Write a protein that binds this ligand. Structure first.
Ligand SMILES: [Zn+2]
Ligand SMILES: [Zn+2]
Length: 155
């Protein structure tokens, strides 16, 4: 089962969404692509060795999304990002149910489209968000508030 990426979707979110559509573990996707543990590293936003051309093309062969498009699920060259905290604009999620790579940019604190501060934890119960690959439903894993409803609590 193939999936079309959402605009701005992060690599972690896309990988997990592909895995859910195919009932794959991270190790299973890694074996399908021939790169093993690299998949789980990318899902946790760990790129001490940056994704190589061969690794991106290996994943591209499985998910049928070109390496160039996969690179747009990561920050451009020179744009620093953070693996933690995982962040969210609930108003964005209501429009398109994905985590955006921009929300991990170190320079980003406000959603430009919605002119709201982005969230660094659930505004109802304060639970931090899991890595985007594990965003199985669109709700806080603790209190079960929908990400879309968190828009109403954004400041
Ligand atoms: Zn937004
Ligand atoms: Zn919560």
């Amino acid at each position: 089962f193939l999936i079309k990426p959402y605009e701005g979707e992060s690599l972690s979110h896309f990988l997990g969404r592909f895995r859910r559509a195919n009932h794959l573990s991270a190790s299973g996707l890694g074996t399908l692509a021939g790169i093993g543990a690299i998949v789980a590293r990318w899902e946790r936003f760990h790129f001490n060795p940056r994704p190589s051309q061969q690794e991106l093309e290996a994943i591209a062969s499985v998910v049928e999304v070109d390496a160039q498009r996969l690179a747009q699920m990561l920050p451009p060259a020179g744009v620093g990002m953070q693996h933690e905290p995982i962040r969210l604009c609930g108003a964005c999620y209501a429009e398109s149910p994905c985590h955006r790579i921009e929300w991990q940019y170190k320079s980003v604190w406000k959603c430009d489209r919605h002119q709201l501060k982005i969230l660094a934890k659930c505004p109802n119960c304060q639970a931090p968000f899991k890595m985007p690959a594990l965003w199985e439903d669109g709700c806080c894993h603790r209190c079960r508030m929908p990400f879309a409803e968190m828009a109403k609590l954004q400041k």
